[PDB]
């Protein structure tokens, strides 16, 4: 499946860089490269989650070719939305690696121009939309689903950065209420609701009750998944995560810090207060220790299981009347 | 007129920050501030150009209150589009002052998070759109006019930055063909076509021939205007331009450099080659001299007049059947 999708990336790049009024050749050529370097290289859970959902929501006699092309085109839009959020996300959290290569902003000859780059990735979404789903009765729903998805992410990011101000001892604010809302807006909405929703809309399920149903599940799915990102960020093989964890040194509000702050002793609350948020490798190495000294990685395993079950309970109560293997499939793609 | 518009800014900020699921209070509060600090402080040519065009394109018996509220709401969207392009534009060209105050990214406690800030400004546009022009038969035209306006700007910016790579002697590429297309995409499209167009669409003129007509004019208007920005950037009272010119040190492709490169002697082509693009105040002070030694500021005056006339010729040939004082009004707001 993954391989058929990636095969189509070529068709989308050719639709996007065809433009060359040849007065923008250079700009187009530039664009092409930003797409290759930033859309490609990932897992493709999002882009894939849509095309697999369509098939399972649209009758075989309606899964025509055109309806297919529109299927993964919308697939790649979710990709570009990610490509966009990422490219800008790296500059902000100040990253070095993404998808096992150096961040685009870090590439010699990019730096802060990446900002316009991330912008161009956004414009490509809605450019595809107009180019395939235009004559369709869901076109305005797609668009309004992307715009409100971004704004939710963008809000969640605001929360994040707001909760982790550079050089500011901020353990006070690392509560769970916050972490949940933060992840709900910057991750759960666009990485789980968005793909499914696009599917439904494309299949004719423009319902409100339906959509709130999928949302109920998909959102809870999305919280776990970020929780996963938090862990992987610290305790995960860089060669498999294709990126380094900057959460500590970035004074982020992680599940981890929320976790450690929860079961951290008075004496242990400082080692913490003192080492979190600094860029000092040993100050940071000190943090990671306190985690390991708190048995956290096992505390993680627990949740990973208790969460799984609850999601499953959830799927077993709200999926109706959608093919349960629309959510079941997601929770095989991430809950591993 | 200007004062009635600015009065309404309060109503828009209150629509945007009302939101406080109070789980995003901080994010909203943050948002409010990014709007105050970045939407306010300008001339308001764009926001104003729409509300003044509506009145002149919609019959008095149709200019009801609601249709008015929708009028300047769309007015402020063009503002936010600017607020967005600006906030990100400053970080990229590395500015210090905008609207006679320090750039948002420069404010202590912002820096690169401004990127998410600029993003939030965008999301506010389409959030207003959905909030006022939703039930209207032009809603999808507005949206598609903004998205394709941004993408045009974003392309033009790509051109700019592409044509002025940091620390790279780039006089070769400062041709006029380039400068025209560059300005056509990063300035003319969204600062002149966009406001008028939004007006027409709102008034019922969804025509293609009509829209190409206004575009013919408005675009040529927009080229002059950037040309104006180029000059003001160098030869303009900072206390009236509320910002400093970084064009030389940013190795930009200005009308000026295009102008000086045109009538620069062999011997004079270097002083140029040597001093343009450097951050050295005296290297830059050297450039400004060569301009003054080339009589350029008078060469500017000429064009400002020959351009004016041509635009006027243009208005006197394409405005029909729109109130000519829809373009005439613009060319009193800028051609001064
Ligand atoms: C996925 S997006 C919201 C960015 C992240 O969530 P961050 O917020 O921790 O930088 P990451 O998982 O990509 O690291
Ligand atoms: C208006 S927008 C495209 C940015 C500028 O045009 P720049 O391209 O010279 O930075 P400026 O006039 O705002 O300086
Ligand atoms: Mg982040
Ligand atoms: Mg990151
Ligand atoms: Mg992470
Ligand atoms: Mg610029
Ligand atoms: Mg600038
Ligand atoms: Mg300028």
UniProtKB/Swiss-Prot annotation, chains A, B:
Residues involved in Mg(2+) 2 binding: 89, 93
The organism's place on the tree of life at top rank: Eukaryota
Enzyme category, top tier: transferase
Biological processes per GO annotation: cholesterol biosynthetic process; farnesyl diphosphate biosynthetic process; geranyl diphosphate biosynthetic process
Molecular function GO labels: (2E,6E)-farnesyl diphosphate synthase activity; dimethylallyltranstransferase activity; metal ion binding; RNA binding
Regulation affecting activity: Inactivated by interferon-induced RSAD2. This inactivation may result of disruption of lipid rafts at the plasma membrane, and thus have an antiviral effect since many enveloped viruses need lipid rafts to bud efficiently out of the cell.
Record-listed E.C. numbers: 2.5.1.10, 2.5.1.1
GO cellular component: cytoplasm; cytosol; mitochondrial matrix; nucleoplasm; peroxisome
Compartment(s) where it occurs, according to its Swiss-Prot or TrEMBL record: Cytoplasm
Record's keyword annotation contains Plastid: no
Cofactor(s) the record lists: Mg(2+)
Reactions listed under catalytic activity: isopentenyl diphosphate + dimethylallyl diphosphate = (2E)-geranyl diphosphate + diphosphate; isopentenyl diphosphate + (2E)-geranyl diphosphate = (2E,6E)-farnesyl diphosphate + diphosphate
Manner of cofactor binding, per the entry note: Binds 2 Mg(2+) ions per subunit.
Binding site for isopentenyl diphosphate: 43, 46, 82, 99
Alphabetical keyword list: Acetylation, Cholesterol biosynthesis, Cholesterol metabolism, Cytoplasm, Disease variant, Host-virus interaction, Hydroxylation, Isoprene biosynthesis, Lipid biosynthesis, Lipid metabolism, Magnesium, Metal-binding, Steroid biosynthesis, Steroid metabolism, Sterol biosynthesis, Sterol metabolism, Transferase
N6-acetyllysine modifications at: 43, 273
Record-listed Mg(2+) 1 binding positions: 89, 93
Residues that hold dimethylallyl diphosphate according to the record: 98, 186-187, 226, 243, 252
Disease: Porokeratosis 9, multiple types: A form of porokeratosis, a disorder of faulty keratinization characterized by one or more atrophic patches surrounded by a distinctive hyperkeratotic ridgelike border called the cornoid lamella. The keratotic lesions can progress to overt cutaneous neoplasms, typically squamous cell carcinomas. Multiple clinical variants of porokeratosis are recognized, including porokeratosis of Mibelli, linear porokeratosis, disseminated superficial actinic porokeratosis, palmoplantar porokeratosis, and punctate porokeratosis.
Subunit details: Homodimer. Interacts with RSAD2. (Microbial infection) Interacts with HTLV-1 protein p13(II).
Family the UniProt entry places it in: Belongs to the FPP/GGPP synthase family.
Identification of the protein by name: Farnesyl pyrophosphate synthase
Top-level taxonomy: Eukaryota, Metazoa, Chordata, Craniata, Vertebrata
